[PDB]
């Protein structure tokens, strides 16, 4: 009972951008008020929590292109 597996993916992709002039970008947030009351806080096994955040981001990638590629081969008898 012979088994023969061949996994030959080809990818010639191009995630491309072109942008002549990126700019003149103003991010002027006007402040705020945050209150959080808790008694107890238990966490376990790969928890990702934020509690009480006042957070400003300005993110101007000239490019900002992303490619995510997952090859997963699994074999069981």
Residue numbers in the entry: 304 to 380
Show sentences the authors wrote.
Dominantly inherited mutations in MAPT, the microtubule-associated protein tau gene, give rise to cases of FTD and parkinsonism linked to chromosome 17. Here, we used cryo-electron microscopy to determine the structures of tau filaments from the brains of human MAPT mutants V337M and R406W. Both amino acid substitutions gave rise to tau filaments with the Alzheimer fold, which consisted of paired helical filaments in all V337M and R406W cases and of straight filaments in two V337M cases. V337 lies inside the ordered core of the Alzheimer fold, whereas R406 lies outside it.
